Every structure is written in C-alpha cells, then in structure tokens.
C-alpha cells in the first residue's frame, strides 16, 4: 500500500545543516502522526521529532532546539531542516508513519564527520585461482578499497548473479578510509567461460566502473 | 524518571524449537508497547501490537505475552530466516524509551570452509601497496582462526577481517581477511600463506602462493 | 488588458525576392514598436525604429510599414545570410509585449548528402557503452531519413538526431544521428549500417562497417 | 562603440540565489535606461526589470518581488541580485541599454535545475574512414558526451580550421545528460597528414582536453 521513501543524506561538518525530505510515496501525509527515528551504527534506536495532524513539534531531549520539522501536504512531503550538527549524530535516519503504533517507515543515511575525502574506490579484481579452486567450484571477486563516503555498492554482472555473491562488511583502516571485498563462487568448469564483471557504484560521489575478473595469467 | 527497559540478549537455538524473550520495565508501565523485527541492514517491522494483538501480515510463530510489567515474547517452531534483533518500545507517551535489542543465533552442526587466497593485482603494485586477500567460504562455527604467514613467519598486526551475517538459506558464515603491505615490503618475501583453523577441519588448511609465479 | 501581437511565421523563399511579414496588434496601439533580427544562438539586433524609421547600421533591404494597427515589415531582394527569427515589441510602455517570432527558410534546389559512418572508439568500449555515429554532410532538403540497421534488422528507439542551422554560405543542412548500445549488446552483432534516404539520391545510400575489422 | 558584456551565470537549485553583473563595457551607465530581457530556450522573449536614471524599479509580473536590480556608476556595473528561483526561469539572460528603443544588449546564460551533475565530457575521436571518405574529401570529428552543464565548446586545432567544422546541437538523453558530436571534412589526400586536434572546454567545470583524430588502424 504505502511505500515511504526518503532522500537527502550525505556528509557535512559541524555548524553545517541539511534538509531531509521524507517523500510520502503513499497517501495523506496531511493527517497522520509522523516522526523521525535515529540510530547510531552498532546501537539501539532513538527518537527525534514528531508532527501532529494539526501542527505541533515536541522535539527530543538532546536535540532540543537547533532542529526543525515540517510537512507539505500538497506536495506530500515531510521536511526536516536541521542545522548546527554536533557531529555526534552521525547516524542512520528513519521516518515512520505512526499509526497508533508505528510501522510503515522507510530508510535513509547521514554522516557528520569533521573532514571530507569523498574520493571513491580503488578497484582490483581478485582472480579465480587453483588456491581458491576446490573440486567443483572456484571463487573470484573484486576488492574495492580506500574510500571515505561509507555507502558504496558492488554488484555482479549488473545484478545478474545472486548465487554465491557475498559482499563482506567494509573495514575501517587506520588511514581513516574504508575498504571491502565482494566474492562469488562459480563452477570451476566455468573459470573464464561466462561474464563476471563487478559493477562498482559510489553514490556520494559519482563513480561507476565495471571490472572483469579472469583466472590468473 | 523515564522507563528503562531491559532484555536478555544473545540468543542461540536451532530450527523448529521454542524460544522466549522477556522485556523488563523499570517503572510501573501499563500494558501498551510493541516488538520489532530488525533484520541487519534494513528497516524495522513491528510484530506485536500494543500488548499481544499481533499486527497483521505476520505468520503464526509469535506469541506476545503482556502484563503490567515484565512483558515477554515467545517464538515457537523457528524457521531459518529470522536473523535480526528484537526491540521493545512504548507507545502512548511522546518521547518513548527503546530496548536494548536481542540478536539471535541459529545453530547448525559442522561445515568446514572453502579457503582461497588471492595475490595482489598488478594494478595495485603500480600504486605502491599490496593487499593479500584470503577468503573462507560458508561455515557454521564462526570461531575460525586466520593465521597469515610470510615466508613462514606468523604475521601480526597488518591484517583485518570481516564476517557476513548468518546466511538465511544454509545458516553459514563467510569470512574475508585482508593483509596489507607496501610494494617495497611485498617484494622482499616469496611465499604468502593463509592458514585456517576450524572445527570442521581435522588439521588446519593452508592456501598459499609464491610471489611472481604465473 | 495587455496587447497580444501575432505573426504568420515559418517563411520560405529564395534569394533576391520579395517577402513580407505582418504583425497583428490585438488592441488599439498607436504607431510605436520595433522589429528585431535574432540569428540563432545570438543576441537580437533591432532594425526598424519606433515605426519605420529604420535604425542606422543596416542595409537597404528592409522596409517597415507602419499604421495604427497591423504593422508590416517587408524584405525585398533577399540575401543568403538572414537565417533567424523576427520579433515585434512595443516601446513606450514599461512592461512590453513581444511577438511570436517568424523563422524564415531559404529554398535551394537539389544537393545530396555526403554520408559517413563512425564505429565506436576503443576507449568507449572500455567504459562499457558503444556510440555509433552516422553523419550526413551538406544537403538542402532536410527531410532526410536515417535508418540504422544492425545485422540487417531495422533499429527503432535507440537513436538520436540533430541538425544544423541552414548554412549561411551554401544554404545546406547537416545531420548527425547517434545509435547508442551497451558494450555487451554491441559485441552480439557484426554489421552496423546506416541507410540514408534523400531526394538528391536516386536510391538510398548505405554506409556500413563490420565490428572488429581493421 | 559600446560593447556590453555580462557575467555570473551558472547552475543552482530552488530557494537559491545569484548576482548577475552587467559589466558596462562602454560608457555612462549612470544615466541610461537599462533592462533585463529573458527567454526560455525554444521560446520568445520576456521582460524582467528596469532601472531609471534616477532610480526606480518596476519589476515584471511573475517575478514581482523576490528579485532585485541596482547599478553602480563608479564601477560602471549593473547589479541583479536574485533569490528564491522557482527553477521555472531556466533561461538565457540578456541585459540591454534602452536608448529610446533598445539595441546594445550583450548576452549571458543561467540554469536552475533541481539537481547538480557538473561533470564534464566523455570524449572520443571519430576517425576518418573510407565509409566517410568519398572522392576528394573525408570527414573526421570528435564525440563529446554525457555532461549536464549545457554550455560546452569544442574547437578544431585551437580555432584554426573554420572550413567544414560543424558542431551539431547537443542532444538530451533519457539519462538526463547532454551529448554532441562535431565533425569537419578535409581532403582525402590529407587523412593523417596535418594536425586535427579537437579542443574540448567545459566552462561551468574546468575541463580542457585536446584529442587527436587519426584514420582507423
């Protein structure tokens, strides 16, 4: 029925600001209790703000002031204009339609680091090899490293292969940049035979690169 | 005074069984809250209504038991596909308190990993750094050990691992360890080895290559 | 009530002739406006003053005819170099109303196109996409047809064309059609052909290449 | 005599803003009726604002309010400070010295899209070939594709060749980015003989690349 989608997340420094748009895909945001739910990664949730069908605010404890919610019924959009982020909110933001309980609440991210790198990948193909080969199957993958802007994605063959494709959690190095590697197993009879191209997309930047993985020379 | 709800987290079970999770309420609350299912890397979904009147669009495996305080959820006859955390809330009152979350594991049995070692790509050695990846594919006991060895010297403090969420199909784990060296230091040694220890292996498995051998 | 001026646009003629353009005035205006020459991709230039007293720095080919309403401009003895639109205005009053603009074409005769097909550059196939350009050079009748064929299959809905302004020297047009494919789909076929139909051709011309043949 | 030049156009989103400077190259902007003329592409003109030699405003109909004109006589500059652009003005802006009629009015652009890509070219050389060759002449060119910031230019040999050089109108793809190709014919005896380097410049960004076009291998 109702499929709330949100947009507006990115990266900024303290004293910054940012408008978030809970785009009410779905109906009647004019007459519903709406709210913002926040969670830092590795942590439990937390509640931020709420609008009444009639207009009231009641902000949370720590984000009392410095933080503004509103709606637009004719556009079916909720608007969250924040500013002066203590950078201590670096969190994953959710907007949910409270219907006597909650439920129906999309997703959307944000990070408020005191820097900017915004660079993108460093992609290498990890070739299928006999040291990875065992009997009927052999594994190959793509290593995408050294990027700051956390949300990054790597698909296999434009989203074709869903068998054996496993992207591992990104790792945060001492350099301050993330890195990850996604690997997929495929029958050892099919080392080079078919197409295995990893599609790397970096959404905070605009990086899009396809890398083919082939057995070692 | 706000309510501080508590939960006995870190569950572990097998399929088709009964498990039961309680939620403390460190003040006198009435009988109106709610449970949520938080699969990893996703949005929550509420299961139990403001007591036990389970919200629609859910199977017949959850049985919320309500009271004045000490609320309790119970899963009977598990199914491999509930890898996530379960929270408490507390409707009615504006600023509401949330729980602490209970991750729930899913026992399996015994399944050794497929191991695979990847040397650094020629493109990266141009850049001046060498990543050496070692992959451990599918495996129940996650308590696996990855020992890197360079020319038979156990390598400490230049590796990083990460592990996947328990697989919703076959309930296994997969692990990737990355060893990071400079081009200069890489070119100073020959054998790169990755020795994996695991309960499904009778003795550890080593996958290795020799730098510079097609 | 604002004035709404009108114009009978889309003129077509030959060189050295007489052509005449009128400008309606849907209210009682006096006799103070102005005409402009707008060459494409440039700034206007006013020719006729606030009636017919043509502003200086212009040749003797324009003859603005003024009245109470229904103003009218006339070009006699055309010259190949007036490829642009002509507007009306209305000085005096602050917020002024503008016309609708009349583009004017220049007849020629018969001149077929030089055709040329360009395969995608090796750099682009790395990126993962293939543009296949087909060029039609110099040509009067612009009513040309570009049919792409891939292995003799007429291609519909993956091309885009654009056309140049009528050339100020030889009064011709030039057209570029781009066919866009993925690298994957490009590598699935052999012959890429571009078949041009035009009045100066007795039967259509096809320029074609064979993917992967130096 | 008088050679009015203007500067300040670019790209922005709604609620944005922008100062435009009609730089009075030429004399006496202190005592002349000046005005702003606007046209959307593919459309007729439209009038915006006007300053009197003595100071008065009289803005247009739809841009009533939210839009400010001024002059500076000692600097010989007209200043147009706008803000809160409904993005529905995405247009090509002109400033003209009204002298009992008009005339003497430079040019200058602007776009107010609700996004930003700002990326730049993707240049390929389209080689001269026998399929393009016919008798005495053969054609070669440069394909510059996938860019948002509309004003882009490609010259041939730093502006040397003016014969046969024809840049075709840019095309707007479904992806939302523009693309174009500029081609020039040159005697077929001169396929590789002389220099044919396309100079690609992207002014909203700062991209400048020279690409040589040579016959196919």
Q: DSSP for C52-116, please give it.
A: S---SS--TTB--B--SS-EEEEEES--S---SEEEE---SSSS------EEEEE-----PPEEE
Distance CA A54, CA A84 (A): 27
Distance CA B133, CA B209 (A): 12
Instruction: Check CB contact under 8 Å for C133 and D185.
Output: no
Distance CA A213, CA A184 (A): 11
Q: How was this structure determined?
A: cryo-EM
C194 touches C117 (CB < 8 A): yes
Distance CA B68, CA B53 (A): 15
Query: Count of residues for chain A?
Result: 217
| Tokens coding B195 | 């020795």
Tokens 């076929």, located at residue: C189
D59: nearest CA partner in chain C: C95
**Burial track B187-199 (b if 16+ CB lie within 10 A, e otherwise):** eeeeebbbbbebe
The secondary structure of residue C170, as a DSSP letter, is T
B84 touches B38 (CB < 8 A): yes
Distance CA C18, CA C13 (A): 9
The phi, psi pair for C187, rounded to 5°, reads -65, 5
Q: Which of D100, D125, D132 sits opposite C135 (nearest CB)?
A: D132
β-strands B205-210, A178-187 pairing: unpaired
A46: nearest CA partner in chain B: B98
Q: Does A34 contact chain B (CB < 8 Å)?
A: no
D182 touches D168 (CB < 8 A): yes
Neighbouring residues of D9: CB distance < 8 A, sequence distance ≥ 6 = D18, D20, D93, D108, D109, D110, D111
Chains A and B lie in contact, requiring 3 or more CB pairs less than 8 Å apart: yes
Q: Outline where C87-194 has alpha helix (H).
A: 122-127, 183-186
Distance CA D44, CA D47 (A): 10
* Cross-strand bridge partners of residue C205: C196
Q: Measure B174 CA to nearest chain A CA, in Å.
A: 8
Q: Outline where B52-166 has alpha helix (H).
A: 122-127
Q: Which chains touch B (3 or more CB pairs under 8 A)?
A: A
Chains C and D lie in contact, requiring 3 or more CB pairs less than 8 Å apart: yes
Cα dihedral angle (D151, D157, D162, D166), rounded to 10 degrees? -50
Instruction: Check CB contact under 8 Å for D105 and C43.
Output: yes
Task: Please determine whether the domains at A5-110 and A122-212 fall in the same fold group of CATH.
Answer: yes
Distance CA C151, CA A126 (A): 37
Dihedral sign for Cα atoms in the order A142, A147, A150, A153: negative
C49: nearest CA partner in chain D: D101
Chain A residues touching B123 at Cβ < 8 A: 124
Tell whether B210 is in a known binding site. Answer: no
CA distances from residue A113 to A62, A192, C190, D54 in whole angstroms, order as listed? 19, 42, 52, 52
Closest CA to C84 of C43, C122, C127: C43
Cα dihedral angle (B176, B177, B182, B186), rounded to 10 degrees? -100
> Measured in whole angstroms, how far is the alpha carbon of residue B131 from the centre of its chain?
24
D94 touches D105 (CB < 8 A): yes
D91 touches D42 (CB < 8 A): no
| Tokens coding C19 | 């052509």
Distance CA D183, CA B74 (A): 73
| Tokens coding B40 | 């990893």
Chain D residues touching C163 at Cβ < 8 A: 168-169
Q: Outline where A135-203 has alpha helix (H).
A: none
| Tokens coding C206 | 């096809």
C141 touches C170 (CB < 8 A): no
Q: Which fold has domain D122-212?
A: Immunoglobulin-like (2.60.40)
Tokens 């933080």, located at residue: A67
Q: Which of B44, B99, B209 sits opposite A131 (nearest CB)?
A: B209
Closest CA to D41 of C2, C85, C47, C5: C85
Q: Measure C35 CA to nearest chain D CA, in Å.
A: 10
B161 touches B125 (CB < 8 A): no
> Measured in whole angstroms, how far is the alpha carbon of residue D174 from the centre of its chain?
22
Tokens 């156990």, located at residue: B154
Q: What share of chain C is helix, strand, coil (3-state, %, to 5)?
A: 5, 35, 60
Closest CA to B102 of B49, B178, B24: B24
Distance CA B178, CA B175 (A): 10
Q: Measure D141 CA to nearest chain C CA, in Å.
A: 9
Q: How many CB atoms lie within 10 A of CB A204?
A: 20
Instruction: Check CB contact under 8 Å for A124 and B160.
Output: no
Distance CA B22, CA B9 (A): 9
Instruction: Check CB contact under 8 Å for B99 and A46.
Output: no
* Cross-strand bridge partners of residue C163: C175
Interface C-D: count of C-beta contacts within 8 A: 124
Q: Measure D124 CA to nearest chain C CA, in Å.
A: 6
CA distances from residue B108 to A113, B28, B40, B74, B188 in whole angstroms, order as listed? 41, 40, 20, 21, 43
Distance CA A8, CA D135 (A): 58
D89 touches D9 (CB < 8 A): no
Q: Which domains does chain B have, with CATH numbers?
A: 5-106 (2.60.40.10), 114-210 (2.60.40.10)
* Cross-strand bridge partners of residue A92: A39, A109
In three-state form (DSSP H/G/I as H, E/B as E, the rest C), the secondary structure along D149-176 is: CCCEEEEEHHHCCCCCCEECCCEECCCC
Closest CA to A32 of A108, A101, A109: A101
D212 touches D197 (CB < 8 A): yes
Whole-number CA gyration radius for chain C: 24
Distance CA C58, CA C64 (A): 13
* Cross-strand bridge partners of residue D153: D201
Q: Does D58 contact chain C (CB < 8 Å)?
A: yes
Tokens 């043509």, located at residue: C54
Distance from first CA to last CA of chain C, Å, rounded?
A: 69
Closest CA to C166 of C78, C76, C72: C78
CA distances from residue C205 to A176, B89, D174 in whole angstroms, order as listed? 60, 74, 30
B150 touches B103 (CB < 8 A): no
Q: Measure C78 CA to nearest chain D CA, in Å.
A: 23
Interface A-B: count of C-beta contacts within 8 A: 124
| Tokens coding C211 | 């993917």
Binding residues of C: 138
Q: Which of D58, D122, D126 sits opposite C133 (nearest CB)?
A: D126
Tokens 């002449």, located at residue: D137
Superfamily of chain region A5-110 = Immunoglobulins (2.60.40.10)
**Which sequence spans correspond to the domains of chain A?**
5-110, 122-212
B88 touches B73 (CB < 8 A): no
Distance CA A28, CA A18 (A): 25
The secondary structure of residue B126, as a DSSP letter, is H
Q: How many CB atoms lie within 10 A of CB D163?
A: 9
> Measured in whole angstroms, how far is the alpha carbon of residue B97 from the centre of its chain?
25
Distance CA A134, CA A129 (A): 10
């Amino acid at each position: 029925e109702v499929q709330l989608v949100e947009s507006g997340g990115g990266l900024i420094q303290p004293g910054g600001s940012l408008r978030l748009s809970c785009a009410a895909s779905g109906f009647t945001v004019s007459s519903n209790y709406m709210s913002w739910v926040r969670q830092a990664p590795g942590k439990g949730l937390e509640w931020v703000s709420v609008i009444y069908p009639g207009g009231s605010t009641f902000y949370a404890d720590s984000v009392k002031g410095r933080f503004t919610i509103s709606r637009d019924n004719s556009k079916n959009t909720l608007y969250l204009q924040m500013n002066s982020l203590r950078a201590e909110d670096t969190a994953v933001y959710y907007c949910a339609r409270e219907t006597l309980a909650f439920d129906y609440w999309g997703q959307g991210t944000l990070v408020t680091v005191s820097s900017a790198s915004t660079k993108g990948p460093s992609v290498f193909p990890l070739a299928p090899s006999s040291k990875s080969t065992s009997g009927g199957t052999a594994a190959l993958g793509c290593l995408v490293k050294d990027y700051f802007p956390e949300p990054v994605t790597v698909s296999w063959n434009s989203g074709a292969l869903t068998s054996g494709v496993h992207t591992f959690p990104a790792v945060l190095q001492s350099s301050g940049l993330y890195s990850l590697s996604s690997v997929v197993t495929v029958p050892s009879s099919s080392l080079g035979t078919q197409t295995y191209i990893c599609n790397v997309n970096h959404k905070p930047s605009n990086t899009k690169v396809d890398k083919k993985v082939e057995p070692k020379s | 005074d706000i309510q501080l709800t508590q939960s006995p987290s870190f569950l572990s079970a097998s399929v088709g069984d009964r498990v039961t999770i309680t939620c403390r309420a460190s003040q006198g609350i009435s009988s109106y809250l709610a449970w949520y299912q938080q699969k990893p890397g996703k949005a929550p979904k509420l299961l139990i209504y403001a007591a036990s009147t389970l919200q629609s669009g859910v199977p017949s495996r959850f049985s919320g038991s309500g009271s004045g305080t000490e609320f309790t959820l119970t899963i009977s006859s598990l199914q491999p596909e509930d890898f996530a955390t379960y929270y408490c809330q507390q409707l009615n009152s504006y600023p509401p308190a949330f729980g602490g979350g209970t991750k729930v594991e899913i026992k399996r049995t015994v399944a050794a990993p497929s191991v695979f070692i990847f040397p650094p790509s020629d493109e990266q050695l141009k850049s001046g750094t060498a990543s050496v990846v070692c992959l451990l594919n599918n495996f129940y006991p996650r308590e696996a050990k990855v020992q890197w060895k360079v020319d038979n010297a156990l390598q400490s403090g230049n590796s990083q691992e990460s592990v996947t969420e328990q697989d919703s199909k076959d309930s296994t784990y997969s692990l990737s360890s990355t060893l990071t060296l400079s081009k200069a230091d890489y070119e100073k040694h020959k054998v790169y080895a990755c020795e994996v220890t695991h309960q499904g292996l009778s003795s550890p498995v080593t996958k290795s290559f020799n730098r510079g051998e097609c």
